[PDB]
Design a protein around this nucleic acid. Structure first.
Lengths: 49, 79, 92, 8, 40, 90, 145, 96, 95, 104, 81, 96
DNA sequence: TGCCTGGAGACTAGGGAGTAATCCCCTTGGCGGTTAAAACGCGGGGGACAGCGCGTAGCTGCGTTTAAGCGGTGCTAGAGCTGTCTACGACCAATTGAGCGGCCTGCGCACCGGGATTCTC
DNA sequence: GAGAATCCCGGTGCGCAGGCCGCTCAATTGGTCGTAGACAGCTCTAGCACCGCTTAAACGCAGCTACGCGCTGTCCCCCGCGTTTTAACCGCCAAGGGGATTACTCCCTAGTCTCCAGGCA
């Protein structure tokens, strides 16, 4: 639902929902830290290690 | 040796009643043995029942009880 | 004196098939069948009572024995018949 | 201490 | 929320009601989205 | 042709297929071992014959099924052995 | 399990002298990597996951460990959990729990960790609950002065 | 007034009660147990008798013989299950 | 906390009589208790039916002897009848 | 005070068997020797099955009888196999029996 | 709860066959065995639920299953009674 | 290295006949039992012992049925077990 | 048709609800890992199944031969029923010890680890 | 001769089986007292053992050909093994609820006994 809301409002986001594969998590971290366009990074509190 | 009294045509009749088309020649001895085993078991139980009653005559009720305990009830003689 | 269900079986047959008779061997078959199902239902009721530590065989025991023994459609029709008979008996 | 004649 | 708090008093325990209330507070679309209406 | 006609003839009938006197002799011979000077009611021997013939017909039906499963029309003693082994009477 | 490779990396970075054994892999691989590990001076430090220790607790429990180090000790915070019971009786000369948050929900988690560490000082949890947990929770909730 | 008539049955509720009492099924027998048992027995008898009479009608006969009872039992699946391990004297077997 | 009658101690005594050294587990003891209960039910029911057939109102040693003969196979039945008659003779002698 | 099992020389309880027979609704009356006979038969059957079970246990270098031993004992003895033909023993397994045609 | 018959797994059916002494198994055996187990469970569970309902209970105990199996002719030892 | 067909099958036959452990996973069986029971009566709770008893009975039944099926397969000169073998075993047993 | 037997009609004690209490124990959505049974390829062997050709063993037809079956008769073993009267089992108070959990702790059994033997190719 | 699977002997740890301790409740002991049935004694039924005809079924041979079985020859489908999926399963975080057991009370409802007439064999 947050994806729907953010895409409606125009905020670019990345997602790490606890079901993403481990090799993808480091890639997402590096992209978010490197890209200044990505406004939000929705996350699950119990995930990510 | 009264087991030969169960003649080969009688075994054929029983097989035909069961829908058997062709019968091998060695079926007759096998079915005589099977019938002997079945009769031995049922008659042993019936004689046990008759002895328990202090009777010297094996009544139809004894055979009915023996068959019932063997797992195959028989209707028409118990009443 | 020997007791049998022949008279009641004949009455039921006349109710269901008024013009159809029954031979003596067939009547014996019917008496044996009635005795068999009676003994089976009573034995199951006895086991149900003993398992539940109950000293009395009531309508619940017979109904449960009927449900356990008889197959589906027969079981449900017999349960309906027994409930109807008990309801009529209590209200008379 | 106990033996059965069925086996023997 | 009022419907769930009414369901508190009657099979759902306090835990199930608690989780449903948390979901309601999050978003009602977690229960059923608004329908896409089309002709019959 | 004759086998199918014989099947239908015996299948429609209800009379006992085993002769009564030989079966009575066999029953008395079997009962001789268990107890001496045993008397039998006629109804008892008739009941024994009814049960034995029903048992044999049911067994033959199961053996026919076993023979058909072996792609054979003839019934062989191995079919009787398998029928009794699967039924559990072995 | 996620931190296992990082810990192996840290051990190799700081102390290359230690013979590091890592216990990851399927059952056949684990059995192969075990073979001949009872030999003296065959491995110095072993790294293994909570799930693997729980599954292979028969092999690890018997052996006489010198130190038993538990990274992220909050995994042991529930004494009713199978992990705490399985890891409680390991043969270790010394024990060391590493954590960032010793207390998360209630003092009973702290008692669980302490009992895992010093059983002869924290023998009873009913006595601990009566002495500290219930009154302090009452103080936080305002039910006690 | 007969108890069987009170229950609206044809089978002897009194005899069924006496058989349940004399039999060692339980040390106490309720009032409704014989009525229920009699009703069940009567229904089963009526079912098998109706099927046997239909079989007799199909054979252009007026009396139910054991063969008709055998055909009725084996043709009805539920009654065949109920009397599966039962042999009927002079009944024969189903055509095949 | 309630009494639960079982044949555990008696089965253990018989086991010690047969094998003084061997022991028995909880599942095996439960199986043995179930077996004893099942055999007891079989013999008791057969005896009750035998008494009912002969219009007798009592279960005696004769009824149970006939029940054992009916239920158990050959050598088992013979040895069981021997043991039972020995037990009843000793019981009558001890008065 | 001397128990009836002691008088009969058995290990199984005669008094308990008598109470079970009386309370089981098998007959109006229960004879004096009926519990003794039934207890003797039960003790004999228990002795047979336990002797075979212990013999099976020794072959496995184990002192305590486990249910597998009882299953092996019952199935290997033809008479006990017939007695317990329609009986399933929990955690009993099956006898090792591979048909000859399947062997290489 | 739906389509749980697939929980009876192909390796599980293979293991049961291997305990039964089967050397080679056809591909269509799994569906047949699933159906047979479904039928057997249906019968036993129906009887057990009848026994539990008679006692005015809502929990199916092991004694009820043992009684149901005994009624079916499959008396089971080791679970009481 | 590669074992010829049939050797591993015999090896696992011996392995699974040596042991007495249950061969079906407990959770899938528990779900199957609950799925079958919900049709007969809703809101039914199963004790763990009841589910274990059901699993033991079902596994014993299936093992015995597979023994009969293998005997059927050896009959008619085969080694593989086919659905016709199970059907013949069940029909001879008196089921269906 | 002449009974036994099932059915009113009065007491009466206890079995079986109600009703606490009481103790035991998880219970269930949504989350997040994480292994080890499943699930999915796939190459190839071997078993399944389809011919095909014998040749022998079941089947059919016939003419004897045999004994099952049926109807009298006849004699008694023995099944079934009845009257006596005892021995035996059901109840019933007092004893009392054998058999229950409660609680503990040796010890048997499960498991692991090298080295050796056995099995398959 | 290689590999792979068991097997076999020490060590070791854990949890449960076998034992000891109170306590109680259910066997046991010593009585009374109905009555179930063990035992004569009788009766009369049907089970058995003999005939002597009728004739339908059983049997032995001959001729025949139908199918069971062995032998080949595809070919497909299932097994053994490697690689990838995923779903059992544990953990969590919450607030209290079941839901079967054991004790009290208490009140319908069966059993028991008497008498009678009518259902039924």
């Amino acid at each position: 639902v947050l994806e729907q809301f953010l895409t409606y409002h125009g905020h670019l986001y990345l997602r790490l929902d606890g079901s993403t594969r481990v090799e993808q998590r480091q890639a997402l971290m590096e992209r978010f830290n490197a890209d200044k366009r990505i406004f939000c990074f929705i996350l699950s509190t119990r995930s990510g290690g | 040796d009264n087991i030969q009294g169960i003649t080969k045509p009688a075994i054929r009749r029983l097989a035909r009643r069961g829908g058997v088309k062709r019968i091998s020649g060695l079926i007759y001895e096998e079915t005589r043995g099977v019938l002997k085993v079945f009769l031995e078991n049922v008659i042993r139980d019936a004689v046990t029942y008759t002895e328990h009653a202090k009777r010297k005559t094996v009544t139809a009720m004894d055979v009915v009880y023996a068959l019932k305990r063997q797992g195959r009830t028989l209707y028409g003689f118990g009443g | 004196r020997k007791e049998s269900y022949a008279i009641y079986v004949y009455k039921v047959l006349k109710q269901v098939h008024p013009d159809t008779g029954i031979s003596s061997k067939a009547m014996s078959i019917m008496n044996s069948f009635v005795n068999d199902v009676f003994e089976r239902i009573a034995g199951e009721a006895s086991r149900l009572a003993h398992y539940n530590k109950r000293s009395t065989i009531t309508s619940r025991e017979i109904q449960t024995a009927v449900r356990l023994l008889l197959p589906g459609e027969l079981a449900k029709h017999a349960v309906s018949e027994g409930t109807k008979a008990v309801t009529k008996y209590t209200s008379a | 201490s106990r033996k059965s004649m069925r086996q023997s | 929320y009022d419907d769930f708090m009414a369901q508190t008093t009657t099979f759902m325990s306090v835990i199930n009601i608690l989780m449903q209330l948390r979901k309601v507070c999050n978003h009602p679309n977690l229960f059923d989205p608004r329908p896409v209406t089309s002709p019959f | 042709t004759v086998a199918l006609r014989e099947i239908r003839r015996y299948q429609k009938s209800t009379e006992l297929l085993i002769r009564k006197l030989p079966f009575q002799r066999l029953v008395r011979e079997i009962a001789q071992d268990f107890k001496t000077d045993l008397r039998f009611q006629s109804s008892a021997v008739m009941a024994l014959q009814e049960a034995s013939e029903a048992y044999l017909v049911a067994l033959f039906e199961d053996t026919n099924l076993c023979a058909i499963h072996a792609k054979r029309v003839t019934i062989m003693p191995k079919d009787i052995q398998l029928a009794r082994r699967i039924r559990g009477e072995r | 399990t996620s931190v296992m490779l990082n810990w192996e990396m840290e051990l190799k970075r700081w102390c290359p002298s230690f013979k590091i054994l890592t216990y990851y892999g399927a059952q056949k691989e684990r059995k192969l990597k075990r073979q001949g590990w009872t030999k003296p001076n065959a491995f110095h430090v072993c790294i293994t996951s909570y799930k693997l220790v729980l599954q292979d607790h028969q092999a690890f429990r018997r052996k006489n460990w010198r130190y038993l180090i538990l990274d992220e000790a909050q995994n042991i915070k529930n004494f009713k959990s199978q992990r705490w019971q399985s890891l409680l009786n390991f043969n270790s000369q010394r024990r060391l729990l590493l954590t960032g948050t010793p207390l998360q929900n209630s003092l009973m988690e702290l008692w669980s960790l302490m009992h895992f560490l010093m059983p002869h000082v924290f023998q009873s949890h009913r006595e601990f609950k009566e002495w500290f947990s219930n009154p302090l929770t009452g103080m936080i909730e305002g039910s006690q002065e | 007034k007969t108890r069987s008539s009170r229950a609206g049955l044809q089978f002897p509720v009194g005899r069924v009660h006496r058989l349940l009492r004399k039999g060692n099924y339980a040390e106490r027998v309720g009032a409704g147990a014989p009525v229920y048992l009699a009703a069940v027995l009567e229904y089963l008898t009526a079912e098998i008798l109706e099927l046997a009479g239909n079989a007799a009608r199909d054979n252009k006969k007026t009396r139910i013989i054991p063969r008709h009872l055998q055909l009725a039992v084996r043709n009805d699946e539920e009654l065949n299950k109920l009397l599966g391990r039962v042999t009927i004297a002079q009944g024969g077997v189903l055509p095949n």
